Design an enzyme around this catalytic site. Structure first.
Site, PDB file in Angstrom:
ATOM      1  N   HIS A 200       0.843  -1.194   0.000  1.00 42.30           N
ATOM      2  CA  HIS A 200       0.000   0.000   0.000  1.00 42.30           C
ATOM      3  C   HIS A 200       0.892   1.263   0.000  1.00 42.30           C
ATOM      4  O   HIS A 200       0.629   2.220  -0.719  1.00 42.30           O
ATOM      5  CB  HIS A 200      -0.949  -0.022   1.201  1.00 42.30           C
ATOM      6  CG  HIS A 200      -1.598  -1.350   1.433  1.00 42.30           C
ATOM      7  ND1 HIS A 200      -2.784  -1.718   0.822  1.00 42.30           N
ATOM      8  CD2 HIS A 200      -1.224  -2.411   2.197  1.00 42.30           C
ATOM      9  CE1 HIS A 200      -3.107  -2.946   1.198  1.00 42.30           C
ATOM     10  NE2 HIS A 200      -2.184  -3.387   2.038  1.00 42.30           N
TER      11      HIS A 200
ATOM     12  N   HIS B 102       2.662  11.221   6.985  1.00 43.46           N
ATOM     13  CA  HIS B 102       1.998  10.882   8.238  1.00 43.46           C
ATOM     14  C   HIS B 102       3.013  10.292   9.200  1.00 43.46           C
ATOM     15  O   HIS B 102       3.604   9.273   8.888  1.00 43.46           O
ATOM     16  CB  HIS B 102       0.844   9.852   8.001  1.00 43.46           C
ATOM     17  CG  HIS B 102      -0.355  10.426   7.310  1.00 43.46           C
ATOM     18  ND1 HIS B 102      -1.284   9.644   6.640  1.00 43.46           N
ATOM     19  CD2 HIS B 102      -0.777  11.708   7.179  1.00 43.46           C
ATOM     20  CE1 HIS B 102      -2.222  10.421   6.132  1.00 43.46           C
ATOM     21  NE2 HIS B 102      -1.938  11.674   6.439  1.00 43.46           N
TER      22      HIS B 102
ATOM     23  N   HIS C 226       1.261   9.442   1.423  1.00 42.41           N
ATOM     24  CA  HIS C 226       0.165   9.157   0.508  1.00 42.41           C
ATOM     25  C   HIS C 226       0.465  10.079  -0.645  1.00 42.41           C
ATOM     26  O   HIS C 226       0.764  11.239  -0.419  1.00 42.41           O
ATOM     27  CB  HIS C 226      -1.233   9.473   1.120  1.00 42.41           C
ATOM     28  CG  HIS C 226      -1.600   8.594   2.284  1.00 42.41           C
ATOM     29  ND1 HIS C 226      -2.462   7.526   2.177  1.00 42.41           N
ATOM     30  CD2 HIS C 226      -1.189   8.610   3.579  1.00 42.41           C
ATOM     31  CE1 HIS C 226      -2.568   6.928   3.351  1.00 42.41           C
ATOM     32  NE2 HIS C 226      -1.816   7.574   4.219  1.00 42.41           N
TER      33      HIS C 226
ATOM     34  N   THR D 133      -6.677   3.943   6.671  1.00 38.07           N
ATOM     35  CA  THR D 133      -6.614   2.670   5.981  1.00 38.07           C
ATOM     36  C   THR D 133      -7.225   1.601   6.864  1.00 38.07           C
ATOM     37  O   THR D 133      -7.135   1.649   8.091  1.00 38.07           O
ATOM     38  CB  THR D 133      -5.169   2.258   5.772  1.00 38.07           C
ATOM     39  OG1 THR D 133      -4.480   2.455   7.009  1.00 38.07           O
ATOM     40  CG2 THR D 133      -4.422   3.169   4.804  1.00 38.07           C
TER      41      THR D 133
ATOM     42  N   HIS E 120       5.072   7.256   6.779  1.00 37.34           N
ATOM     43  CA  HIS E 120       4.848   6.832   5.411  1.00 37.34           C
ATOM     44  C   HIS E 120       4.119   7.995   4.696  1.00 37.34           C
ATOM     45  O   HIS E 120       3.733   8.956   5.338  1.00 37.34           O
ATOM     46  CB  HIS E 120       3.897   5.615   5.390  1.00 37.34           C
ATOM     47  CG  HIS E 120       2.496   5.914   5.867  1.00 37.34           C
ATOM     48  ND1 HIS E 120       2.112   5.806   7.189  1.00 37.34           N
ATOM     49  CD2 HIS E 120       1.387   6.323   5.193  1.00 37.34           C
ATOM     50  CE1 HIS E 120       0.826   6.119   7.307  1.00 37.34           C
ATOM     51  NE2 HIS E 120       0.371   6.466   6.112  1.00 37.34           N
TER      52      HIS E 120
END
Ligand SMILES: [Zn+2]
Length: 257
Positions: A61, A116, A93, A196, A91
Site C-alpha cells: 500500500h 503521516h 500518501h 486505511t 509513510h
C-alpha cells in the site's frame, strides 16, 4: 485484500470494515472559515532528538519507515494531547499527478502528497493495545507541494529501488525525521481514525498548516514503487489516498489565529 484500486478501493472498504461509515472517519476537508482558533490549546512539542530508525518497507500500500519505540526517543506531547505518544513509523500518501495525492484538504485544495508520522499513547504499553482506544494514536500530518527538493527526504528516496515491490525490506538506520518538518508548527486538530483498513477511530489528528516542498524528482521516485509483489502483474503504487469523509458532528480546531 483491500487496496486503492477500482475493486478493492475506498468504496469497498465498508464491506469488511463497517466502521468505514462511522462517526469519526478520516481524512476530512479542512474548512478554514469554520475551523475556529482554539485558545485553550497548548503548544505542540515535537521531540525527535533521539529517534532511532530501524528499516524501510513496502507493505503493498505504501512504504513505512519504522522506528524503535521501546523508549521515549521520539515523542509528541502537548497540543490537544493528553500525555506522551511515541513515534512508531511514518509513510506517505501520493497521487499519479501533482494535482492530487493528499488525504486532508484545505478549503478543498488538494496537495501533491501528505506525510503521516504515526504515534501511540504510552499509557497503553505498545501499539497493539493503543490502536483500539479513542485516545490511542496521534498522527502528525504534513502536506507536500512540488518545488525545491527536501534535503531531509533524500536519504529515503535513494533507497526506494531496493523495496520496489510488496514484501521487500531493507536496513534503514540513523534517518532523522526532524528533516521532514516545515518551519511552523501551526496546526489544525480533530478526532479521527486510521485512513486505511481497519479504519479504527482512535486517532487524534494534528495537521500542520505549512507544507514542505519536495522536488518533482523525489515524488517521481515515489511513483515507481509497486503495489504488487515480485513476479505479479506490475501495478504502479500511485493514488494511495482515501478521499475526504463527512465531518459529521465534529469540530476542527486551529492552534493559530
Ligand atoms: Zn497515512
Amino acid at each position: 485484500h483491500w487496496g486503492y484500486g477500482k475493486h478493492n478501493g475506498p468504496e469497498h472498504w465498508h464491506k469488511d470494515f463497517p466502521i468505514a461509515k462511522g462517526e469519526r472517519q478520516s481524512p476530512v476537508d479542512i474548512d478554514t472559515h469554520t475551523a475556529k482558533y482554539d485558545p485553550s490549546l497548548k503548544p505542540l512539542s515535537v521531540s525527535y532528538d533521539q529517534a532511532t530508525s530501524l528499516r524501510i518497507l513496502n507493505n503493498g500500500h505504501a512504504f513505512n519507515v519504522e522506528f524503535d519505540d521501546s523508549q521515549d526517543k521520539a515523542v509528541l506531547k502537548g497540543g490537544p494531547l493528553d500525555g506522551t505518544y511515541r513515534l512508531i513509523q511514518f509513510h506517505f500518501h501520493w497521487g499519479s499527478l501533482d494535482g492530487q495525492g493528499s488525504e486532508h484538504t484545505v478549503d478543498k485544495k488538494k496537495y501533491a502528497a501528505e506525510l503521516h508520522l504515526v504515534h501511540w499513547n504510552t499509557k497503553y504499553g505498545d501499539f497493539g493495545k493503543a490502536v483500539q482506544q479513542p485516545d490511542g494514536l496521534a498522527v502528525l500530518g504534513i502536506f507536500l507541494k512540488v518545488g525545491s527538493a527536501k534535503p531531509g527526504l533524500q536519504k529515503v528516496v535513494d533507497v526506494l529501488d531496493s523495496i520496489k515491490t510488496k514484501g521487500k525490506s531493507a536496513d534503514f538506520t540513523n534517518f532523522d525525521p526532524r528533516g521532514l518538518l516545515p518551519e511552523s508548527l501551526d496546526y489544525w486538530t480533530y478526532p479521527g481514525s486510521l485512513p486505511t483498513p481497519p479504519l479504527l477511530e482512535s486517532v487524534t489528528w494534528i495537521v500542520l498548516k505549512e507544507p514542505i516542498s519536495v522536488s518533482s524528482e523525489q515524488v517521481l521516485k515515489f511513483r515507481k514503487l509497486n503495489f504488487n509483489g515480485e513476479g505479479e502483474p506490475e501495478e504502479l503504487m500511485v493514488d494511495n489516498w482515501r478521499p475526504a469523509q463527512p465531518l459529521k458532528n465534529r469540530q476542527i480546531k486551529a492552534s493559530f489565529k
